[PDB]
Amino acid sequence: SAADYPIFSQRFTADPAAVVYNGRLYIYCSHDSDATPGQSTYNIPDITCISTDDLKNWTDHGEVFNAKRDSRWASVSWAPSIVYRNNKFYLYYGNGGNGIGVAVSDSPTGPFKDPLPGPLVSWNTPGVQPAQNMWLFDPGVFVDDDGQAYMYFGGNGQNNIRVIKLGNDMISTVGSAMTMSAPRFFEAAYMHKYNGKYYFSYASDFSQGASKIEYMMSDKPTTGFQYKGVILPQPPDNYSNNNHHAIVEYKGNWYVVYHNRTVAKQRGLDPVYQRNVCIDQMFYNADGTIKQVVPTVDGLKQ
Amino acid sequence: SAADYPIFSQRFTADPAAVVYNGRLYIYCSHDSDATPGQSTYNIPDITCISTDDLKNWTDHGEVFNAKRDSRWASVSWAPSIVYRNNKFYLYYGNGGNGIGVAVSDSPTGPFKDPLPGPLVSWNTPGVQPAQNMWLFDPGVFVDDDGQAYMYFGGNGQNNIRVIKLGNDMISTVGSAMTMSAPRFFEAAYMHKYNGKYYFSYASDFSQGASKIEYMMSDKPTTGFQYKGVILPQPPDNYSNNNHHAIVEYKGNWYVVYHNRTVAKQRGLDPVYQRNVCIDQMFYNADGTIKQVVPTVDGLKQ
Amino acid sequence: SAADYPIFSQRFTADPAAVVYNGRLYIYCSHDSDATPGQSTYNIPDITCISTDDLKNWTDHGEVFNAKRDSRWASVSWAPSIVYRNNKFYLYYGNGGNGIGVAVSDSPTGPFKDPLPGPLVSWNTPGVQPAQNMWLFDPGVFVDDDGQAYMYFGGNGQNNIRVIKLGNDMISTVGSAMTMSAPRFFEAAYMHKYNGKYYFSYASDFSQGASKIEYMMSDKPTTGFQYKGVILPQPPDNYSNNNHHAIVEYKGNWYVVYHNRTVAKQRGLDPVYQRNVCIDQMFYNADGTIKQVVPTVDGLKQ
Amino acid sequence: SAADYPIFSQRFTADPAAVVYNGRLYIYCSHDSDATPGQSTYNIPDITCISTDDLKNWTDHGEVFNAKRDSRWASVSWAPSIVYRNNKFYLYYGNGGNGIGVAVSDSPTGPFKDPLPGPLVSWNTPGVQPAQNMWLFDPGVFVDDDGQAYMYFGGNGQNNIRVIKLGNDMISTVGSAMTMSAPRFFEAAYMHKYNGKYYFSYASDFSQGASKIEYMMSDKPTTGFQYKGVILPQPPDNYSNNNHHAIVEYKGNWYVVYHNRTVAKQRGLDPVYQRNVCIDQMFYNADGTIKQVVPTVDGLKQ
Amino acid sequence: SAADYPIFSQRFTADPAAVVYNGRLYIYCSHDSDATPGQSTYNIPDITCISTDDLKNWTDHGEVFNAKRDSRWASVSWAPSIVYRNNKFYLYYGNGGNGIGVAVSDSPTGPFKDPLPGPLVSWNTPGVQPAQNMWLFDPGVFVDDDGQAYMYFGGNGQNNIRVIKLGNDMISTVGSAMTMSAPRFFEAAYMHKYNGKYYFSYASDFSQGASKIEYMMSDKPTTGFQYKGVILPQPPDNYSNNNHHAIVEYKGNWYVVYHNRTVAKQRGLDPVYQRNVCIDQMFYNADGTIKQVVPTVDGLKQ
C-alpha cells in the first residue's frame, strides 16, 4: 500500500533509465540507502547519471536530482523515467510509494527541478482507483509519433496497470487513467515503439518461478496487446525484487539495460561508477517479436 | 525410529515458529549443537526468541525454554510450535524423537515451564500406532474458530500424518489421534486458516527432487484435503533436511518464515541474532490457492 | 583401451567400497595421485579404510592394500570391492585398466595380500571378448543366498557389462563371463539384493546430461533386468568421471555411499580422514523400487 | 403406525446397546415377552445389563430400567441407546411405538429413572411430520466432538430417517428434527464416529433379499452421506425383524454387537445371561470404509 | 497383537499338519482348550498325531509335543508345521501369538523337544517389522529342491506375509525376513511345490464373504506370485476362524487336509481319534492350476 512496502521498496537497489542525446547514451539510476559491507558510511537518496559514446568508456555526471532539495513535496526518487522533448529533459520518479513526480532540466545532466506543488500522479488521480493493492512508484513514459505522451504505471497484479495521457508540456495529465492487463504483471511497466508496433515490457511476478522481464505487443499504445514471451530470464534473476529496465535504440542498435548484481559480477566492472547495470543488445525477428538478447562484451569500434 | 535419527535429527539446524502478540512478531528457534567453523566453543540446546515491530529492527530475547531446566522429563527441544490462548503462551516441542512436550508462560518471552510429568504426545498415545516408521518430534498446533485446538504431527510417509484434539487448557489431549495423508509427506506438518479454508502445509520427501514446502487445502481441519502445490521450491533448498516453517498473519499481510542458510546468504544479515531465518510475503488467489511468495527486501514503512 | 585412459582413469579421485562387520561399517577408498593445491608433497597409490559404529565418529585404519607391495603382478589398485566370506575378507581391485585382482585378509583392516600370479579377470578371460572398447577395472562382487558369488564388471557401453561366477574360495573364476545390458551403461557395475530382488546399479554415460547413478531390477542375478530409474542425480554430479558407489545395509537401514567433492563441501567434514565420501540413507517403495535417498545429517542415537 | 406393529414389534426379541466405562464393556438389552418352549412362566418387560472386562467372562447386572416403575408415562422399553455424559448415563428407549423416552442414572447399572412427564420425542415433535408411515421407537444417540448431541430415529422407508439435536442436559431437544435418507432404510438408525468421519449404520428393508446391517459415510453428522455397503449380511439373518446393533470401541479395537439366535447357536453360549448377542471385531480400510467383520472366538489375553 | 487375540486365537480349535514317512501319512493337530458340552473335564494343550497307511484305518499316537514340558520358553503350541529332513522331524509351532518355535525328534511320533532358549522367530526377528497389526503364530515350512528351507508366516493383511530362510540344521534362521503379498491374506501361509511351480496357499479374510482357502502360483519361492483362485470354498466354512491346512502328496496322489466340524459331520467319523479333520483329493490342470478338490469317500484299495 503502504502494507506491501517490504516487498516493493526500492531502497536498497538501483533502478535504471536511459536516453540518447547528442550522440551519447545517458543512464540514470535511483539510489536510496544503505550499503554497509563491514562497516561503511554509505548513502544519499537521489538519481545519478553516467554517459558514454562507445559503451566502454563512461563519464560520471553524479547526482542530477535530489527530491528533498529539488521538489517541493517529495523526499525520495525511485524508478526514474527520462524523456527528451521540447528541447528539455523530463525525469519522472516515484516518491517511495507516495506519488509520482516530474522534474525538468535543459540539460541531460541537470539540475532537474520538479515545478509542481504535489505529485503529477497519485492515488486520487482519476481512473487510478478502483484498484486492489496497486503500487504507485515506477512510471514508464513514452511519446508516440502523433505527439501524444503517455505514462504507464502500476504494480502487483495482472489488472493493476494504468496508463494516462500527459499534456504536451509533459508536466500535466489529460483525462483519466486507463486500465491495461498483462499476464502476471508485478512492476516496471515500460513502453517502446519499433517498426510500427508497441512493446509493453514489464517485470512479472513470482507465481511461476522467478520474476522475469516479459512483454506484449500491439498495433496500438493502450489496447490490443498480446503476450509474446520473456525478454530476459536471468538465471537466477533475484535480488532484489528489481527488474526495472530500459529499452533504447543507440547508433542503430537496440539495447536492454537492467540492474543485476549477479550478472554484472560474471562480466566485470562497476561503470566508473554505476552498479551492476548490465547492457545487452536486443534483436528482432521479421515479425517484430524479440529474437534474442545478447551480452555485450566490448564497446563500439568507432 | 530411533533408526532414522541420522536423517530426521534437527541437532545442527534451527527450526522456527512464529506468533503475533501486542503489535509485535515473535520468532522462536530451536538450537541444539555444535557449530565449530575453526574451531569454536559454540552451543546450548534450547529455544530462543527474537521479535520485531517492523520486520527490519529485531530485539533478541535470548533463551525462553531449556528442556533440562524447564521440564521434568525432556532433555532436548526441537521444532517449536507456539500458540497464544487463555492469556498464556503454549510452546510445544520435540524431545529429540522421544515424545512431544508443552511448556507454558504468561509472557511471549518466557520463562516457559512444562508442567507435565511426561510427554503430551508419544508413541503410545491412542491412535498414533499403528504406523510404519513414523517420526514424532515436530508438532504444528492450531486453534480453530470453534475453540477446538488440534496438534498435527508425524513424519516419513504419505500416510504418516497424525492429528489429535487438545483440551481447552492446551496441556492435555482429548480422544485418539486421527490419521491424514498428503503426497510425499516427510516432516513439518503445519496448519493455518485463511478465508474459511484450512491449509495443511508440510515438507515433502526426496522422491522427486529436493524436499519442498508444499500444501493441501480443505473446508475442514482433518478431512477433505486436496493437494494444491508447492509454496516454496527454494532453488536449491537442501541443507539440512529442514523445511520447518511458519505461516502467520501480521499487520494485515501474510508471511512464510523458514530457515535456509543459502537463501539468507543471498540477502544479508543474521537477525541480531537468529540465523538464516528468511521471511517472504505470501499472496493468495481469489480461489484461496497460494498465488506467490515474494522475498521481503525492506521493513514496514510505519 | 588403453586409448580411453584419459576418460576412465581413476588416478585423481577416490573410489569407495563398504562392508559391515562385527557391528561396524568399514569404508574402503582407492587412492592413486597427485593433489598439489599450492604446492604439495601428496601421494601413495593404495586402498585405505576407515570405520564407524555410529556414522559420526570415524576411526582411520590407513592403508590396507598396496598393489606394489602386496601383489606379485599389479602396480595400481582402483575401484575396490569388498566381501566377507569364509571368515576372510576379499578385496577386489583394478590394476589401472590392466586386469582385475583379488587380495585376501583375515581382518577387515588388512594386511591384504593378492595370492595369484596374475589378474583374476583380464581381457582373455573367456566370455569377456568380443567387446567394442570395453574397460576392465571396476568390479562389483556379490555373494547370492545360494552360495554363488558373481563378479560384475565392464565399462563404456550399454552392452559392455560382464558377469562371471567366482569359485567358493573367492580367488578363482568358474566358467565363462556372461553379458548384460543396461541403458547408457558407463562404469561402476554393482549388485545388491533386497527383499528377494536383485538391484543392478551403475554409473550412466554422458549422452543425456551428466553421468548419474541409475539402476535396474530383476528376480534373477544375471538376466531379466528392467531399468527402473535414477538413484542419485547429484546436481551437478561431475568431477571426476566418478560415480563409483556402494549400497549396504547397516543396523537395519540401507545406505548409499559415494564420492562427491561438491556435495561433501555443502555438508562439512573430511571423514578424519577419507574424502569427500557422502552417505545417504536409502528407502524402498512397497514394490521394491527405490523411493528416495536422503542426506544424513547426524549419526546414530545409540 | 399402530397399523404396522405386527412387523415392527420388538416384543419377542432383544435389542442391544453398548457403552464402555471404567475399563468394562456394558451391554444392555430390551426384553418384553413371552418365550414358552413347552411350556414356561417366562417374562418381564424391561432393559437388562451385562458387562465384561475381557469379552469372555460376563457379570449379570440384571434389570436396570423398567418403564412401568421408572417412568411416569411409559409401559414398554424397546431398543435402548446408551450414552455416558456429564458423569451420568442416559438410556433412551422406545415405548412400544408410542414415543421415545430417556432415563438417567449415576451408574452404568442403574437404577435409571425417566425424569420427564412424557416422551422426549414423539409424533408431534417439530420436524418429525410429515412422514409416510414412519415408526418411532429405536433411537440412536451420539455426542459429537463439538459437544452437540444428536438423536437419530425413524423407520420404514428410505426418507423416513430423522435426526434432532439434544440439549447438553441430554433430556431435552433443541430445534426441529431434520430429515435424512438412506437406501432401503428399515429400522435401527445408528451413528458412530471414527477417524474424522461419520458412519450412519442401519437395518435395511426386505426389498432385495433379507434385511441387513448396512451403512453410509459422511464428513458431517446430518448431511453429505454416501452409501458404502453392507456391514453384516448374516447368512441367513432373519428372525426376528431385528438388526438392532451397536458399534463401539473397546480397548483399542472396534466391535459390532448384534442379536442373532441362529448365529449365536453356531458359536456357543448364552452370556450368563444375555441371549443370542453376538460380538464381531470390525476393521477399517485406509479410506475409512469398513474392511470386514470377523467373529470373535476367544476373549482378551489380558 | 495381543489386541486381536479374540479373533486369531486357536484355543478352541485344532490346526492340522501332515507329513509322509516310511509309507504312512501322519497328521498332527494342535489342541489347547476347553470343550464342555454338558458338562466335561476336557483338555490338555499340546500337539497330537495320528497316522494311516490306507486313509481309512487310523492309529492314534497321542501327544507328541507339549510346550510346557518340551520347551524351555513356551506354554502353548498352535498351528503345527512338520518337515522331515536330516533323518529328523522338525515340528514348528506358535506359542499363542508370542513367538514361533521349533521342536525336534528322531521319530515322527516324538517325543519332540525344542532345543532353543527362546523363539526361532519373533517380533524382533530382522525383517518382520515394520508391520501393521501382524500376527505371529502359524508357520508354514518348506524345503526347496536346492536345499534352501523357508518359513512362511504372518497374518491379518494383504502385505502381512513374511518368509525367512532357515539354516540347513532347521533350528536357525539366515538373514532377514522378506515380505510377500496376497489378496485378502488373513492367516495360514503355506507352501508346496508341484511340477516345478510354487503354490502359496492361505486363508483369506472376511472382506468378501467367508474366509476361504485360496492360492497363488509362481516359478520362484518368494517372488513372482500371481493369484489363481479358491482351493476350498467350504459352504459355509466358518467356525472357527480356522482354515489351517496342509497339502501333501501320498502314494502318487495329492491331498488337502483341513479342519471343519460342519463338513466332517456331513461325512462321518472322528479319526479314532482326531477331529473334524477332512481329507479331499486334489487334482491339477495341465497348466498347473488346481482343477478341483474331491471329497474322499473310502480308503486305498491296497
XYZ file of C-alpha atoms in Angstrom, chain A residues 2-12 78 96 132 135 156-158 185-186 205-208 238-241, chain B residues 54-56 251-253 255 262-264 266-267 280-281 283-284 291-302:
56
model
C 1.853 1.112 2.432
C 1.390 -2.517 3.700
C 3.457 -4.024 0.852
C 6.474 -1.711 1.207
C 8.551 -4.675 2.483
C 8.357 -6.197 -1.000
C 8.051 -3.220 -3.342
C 10.647 -0.989 -1.693
C 13.446 0.089 -3.998
C 15.537 1.381 -1.063
C 18.485 -0.933 -1.352
C 12.898 5.815 -7.132
C 8.684 5.944 -2.227
C -6.871 -3.929 -5.446
C 1.543 0.173 -6.075
C 1.045 -6.020 -8.105
C -1.437 -7.732 -10.339
C -2.383 -8.714 -13.878
C 2.201 -8.225 -14.007
C 4.335 -7.256 -10.972
C 5.505 -11.801 -10.514
C 6.772 -14.768 -8.559
C 3.848 -17.090 -9.318
C 5.727 -19.311 -11.807
C 16.554 -12.496 -7.994
C 17.939 -9.920 -5.545
C 16.299 -7.602 -5.174
C 12.684 -7.583 -6.473
C 8.697 -3.505 11.676
C 10.406 -6.520 10.088
C 13.750 -4.705 9.988
C -0.382 -6.279 10.258
C -2.797 -7.416 7.562
C -0.187 -9.305 5.449
C 4.241 -14.217 5.736
C 21.793 -20.474 1.376
C 18.850 -18.145 0.768
C 19.730 -15.983 3.791
C 21.939 -14.202 -0.831
C 20.069 -11.454 1.110
C 8.724 -13.866 2.469
C 5.318 -12.282 1.984
C -0.300 -13.816 -1.519
C -3.494 -15.682 -2.322
C -0.530 -17.128 -5.678
C 3.099 -16.487 -4.813
C 5.710 -15.929 -2.138
C 7.837 -12.812 -2.578
C 11.167 -12.085 -0.813
C 10.999 -9.222 1.650
C 13.642 -6.561 0.897
C 12.788 -3.883 3.468
C 10.764 -3.374 6.615
C 7.405 -1.766 7.210
C 7.212 1.960 6.399
C 5.446 2.736 9.720
